C-alpha cells in the first residue's frame, strides 16, 4: 500500500498537468518547446496504453520500473512551465 | 663553477642553485639526455 | 516639504521638463549613479531624496562627486534628514 499510494498520488498530477498542457503547445507550436513536450507525450501515452491492456489496480505495483518514469515526466513538466513564464506574462499584459 | 656527478644525491638542488646564481655548470657522468633537462636545453622563458 | 518649491522653480527657470529626480531605496542606487553621470553630461538638474536611510552608500556618492566633470547650469539638489553617523566630506562640500 505504501508503494501504491505514491504511484496513484503521482499519476493524478501527471494526468491533470498533461490535460492542461496539451492544447497550448498544440495551437502555438514553437519547436524548442515541441520536442520537450513530445517526449513527455510519448512517455505518458506509452504507460496509458499498458493500462488500457490490463486494468487491474495492482499491476502498477508490478510494471517495469515506473517510478523513475513518473518522476522524470513530472520534472520535465516543471521545466516546460519555466519555459512558459514568458507567454504567461504576455497574456497577463493582454487582459488586465 | 660547480661540477656535479650524474648519479648524485643532490642533483636537482644543486641544479636549482646553478640556474639561480648564474653559475657555469659541468656535469660528469651523463648516460644520455635526462628527462628533466629538456626546457632548459631548449628556450622556455616565461616573463615576470 | 521642499519638493513643490523645487518643482515650481524648475518650471520657472527651465522649460521642456529638464527636471529629473530619484528617491533612495532598495534597488535604486546603481541607477542613481548612472542618472548622476548622464545628467552631469546633459547639464540638466538632479534631485536626490532621503539620504539619511542609505548611510552606507554615501562614500560612493562623494567619490563620484569628486570625480565628475560637470557642465554649466547643472545643479544638484539633495534632501536629507537629521541623522547621527553621517559622513563629513559631502557636508564640507555643500551648502546647508
Amino acid at each position: 500500500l505504501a508503494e501504491l499510494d505514491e504511484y496513484l498520488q503521482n499519476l493524478n498530477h501527471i494526468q491533470r498537468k498533461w490535460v492542461y498542457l496539451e492544447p497550448i503547445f498544440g495551437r502555438g507550436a514553437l519547436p524548442k518547446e515541441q520536442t520537450r513536450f513530445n517526449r513527455v507525450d510519448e512517455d505518458f501515452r506509452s504507460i496509458m496504453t499498458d493500462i488500457k491492456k490490463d486494468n487491474r489496480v495492482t499491476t502498477l505495483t508490478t510494471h517495469a520500473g515506473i517510478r523513475n518514469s513518473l518522476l522524470t515526466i513530472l520534472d520535465q513538466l516543471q521545466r516546460c512551465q519555466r519555459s512558459l513564464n514568458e507567454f504567461l506574462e504576455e497574456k497577463r499584459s493582454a487582459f488586465p | 663553477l660547480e661540477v656535479i656527478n650524474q648519479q648524485d644525491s643532490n642533483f636537482i638542488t644543486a641544479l636549482e642553485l646553478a640556474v639561480r646564481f648564474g653559475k657555469t655548470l659541468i656535469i660528469q657522468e651523463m648516460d644520455g639526455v635526462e628527462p628533466v633537462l629538456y626546457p632548459l636545453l631548449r628556450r622556455d622563458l616565461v616573463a615576470q | 516639504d521642499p519638493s513643490q518649491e523645487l518643482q515650481e522653480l524648475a518650471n520657472a527657470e527651465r522649460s521642456g521638463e529638464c527636471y529629473h529626480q530619484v528617491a533612495m531605496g532598495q534597488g535604486q542606487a546603481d541607477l542613481a549613479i548612472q542618472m548622476l553621470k548622464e545628467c552631469a553630461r546633459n547639464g540638466d538638474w538632479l534631485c536626490l531624496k532621503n539620504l539619511h536611510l542609505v548611510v552606507s552608500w554615501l562614500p560612493v556618492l562623494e567619490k563620484e562627486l569628486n570625480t565628475l566633470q560637470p557642465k554649466d547650469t547643472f545643479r544638484l539638489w539633495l534632501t536629507a534628514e537629521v541623522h547621527p553617523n553621517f559622513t563629513p566630506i559631502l557636508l564640507q562640500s555643500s551648502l546647508k
Binding site: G65, T72, Q76 | I12, V36, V46, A47 | -
Partner: protein
Amino acid sequence: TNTGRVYRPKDCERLVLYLKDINLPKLDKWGTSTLVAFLQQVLTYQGFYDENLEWVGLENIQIVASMSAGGRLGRHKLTTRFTSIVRLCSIDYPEREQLQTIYGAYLEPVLHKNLKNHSIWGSSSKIYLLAGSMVQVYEQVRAKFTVDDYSHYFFTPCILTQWVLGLFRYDLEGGSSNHPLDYVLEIVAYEARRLFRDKIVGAKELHLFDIILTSVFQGDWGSDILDNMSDSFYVTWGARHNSGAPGQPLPPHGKPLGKLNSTDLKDVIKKGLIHYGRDNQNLDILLFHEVLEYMSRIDRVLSFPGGSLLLAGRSGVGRRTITSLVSHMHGAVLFSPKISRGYELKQFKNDLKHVLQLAGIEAQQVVLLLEDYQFVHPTFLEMINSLLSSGEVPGLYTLEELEPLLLPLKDQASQDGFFGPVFNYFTYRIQQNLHIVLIMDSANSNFMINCESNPALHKKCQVLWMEGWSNSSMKKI
C-alpha cells in the same frame, strides 16, 4: 536471492552488453585469450568466481559482440569453443550504386538548407552527379594506394561521411549570385584536398594524386576549373558576419570558416604573435609560405568539436610553437605534463584527472599536448589510445568518487534532455570538450610499432605529414 548473490538490470528487463571488438584482445604465448575464456565461462555457466572467495551468478544479460574479418595484423583468430556456442553472420561493403544514393540523399539537404530556390543547384541530377564524382575519386584513390606502403593509408566511407558533414562550416550563402559553379567547386576541392592529400608521403605520389583529382574534375566538366586558388586560406579568422574570445560551448559544426588572403592572414598572425609575446617568451618567428599553410591546417582542425592531431615530421621544425600560438589565439588552455626525476604512472593519472575534471565539468575548451620525451613508461600510449577512441579512461576513477563530482550535473542533465545515468553525459562532454596533440618524430625507431600497435591512433586523429621544407623556401630564409 537463494543459491548465491546475483546481478539484475535496474529499471529494465533485458540489459545488453555491446562488445565492440573481439579480434583485438591479446593472446598469451600459447594462443588463449583470458577475455574470450571469461566470456565462454559466462555464456556457458551464467556465472563467475568473483574474488573474496564466492561464486556470483548473473541473471538477465545478453552479449552481442562485433568484429572485423581477420585480415590485417593485430587481428587474432577465435577459438572454436567460443565460435560454435553463439550465432554469427557477415555483411558486405555498400557498393557504388548504393553509395551514390546515400550521398546524393545526404548532399541534397545539407546544400539545400540554403540557396534552395536558385538556378543550377536544385534539380538534383547535379546533386547526384557530384556524389558520383566523389565516389569515383574515393574508388580510384583506393585503387592506387594500399596499407603495404605505410601504417596509415586508411580508407573507409567514414572519410566520405566526415567529408560531406564538413560542409556545414562554409559560407555557401549565394545571395550574391556568383557564376556560381566555381565558388562551390573550389570549396569542395579544398575540403577534399585537406582531407585526402595531407597524409601522402612521397612527392611523386602527391603529383599522381593531383593528376587524379584534376582528371576527375575535367572529365566531369570540361577543363580548367581548379586553376588558381592555391593562395586561398579558409581560416576561422574572417568570414561572413564577423567570426572574429567568449562563447565557451562549441557550435555543433565548429566555428564557421571564410575566405581570406595571404598578407591579411600575415597581419592577423602578427597581431596575435605580438599579443602572445606580451605574456610569454618573445618569439622571433619568420614567415614563408609553408608556415602559413601549417597554421591554416592546424586552425581548420582545432576548430572542430572533438579534434586531435598526429604531427609526424622531422625534429627541429616548429610544431609546438605554432600550436601554442593557435591555442592562445583561440583562447583554449594548453596543457603539457612537466616531467621530473621521479616519473611514475600515478603522476600521469593525477594529471589526467586534472584535465578530465576541467574539460568535463567546467565546459572549457582544452588542448592537451604530449610529445616524445614525456612517454617515459610504456602504458601511456595505451591510455591515450583509449581516451581517444572511447571517451573514458578505464580503471581511472573509483565508484565512490563519481557521485560527489558528477552531482552538479543532474540539473543540466535534466534540462538538456539527455537520459540514462550521469556518467554518459560526463563522457559526452569530454568527447566534445578535449583536444589531444601528439608530436612524434618521423625517423625514430619505435614509430612503426607505435603506429601499428594502437589502431585508433590513426583512426581518430587527422595525421598531417609535416616532413621537409621546400627547396624554394630554404633559399628565401
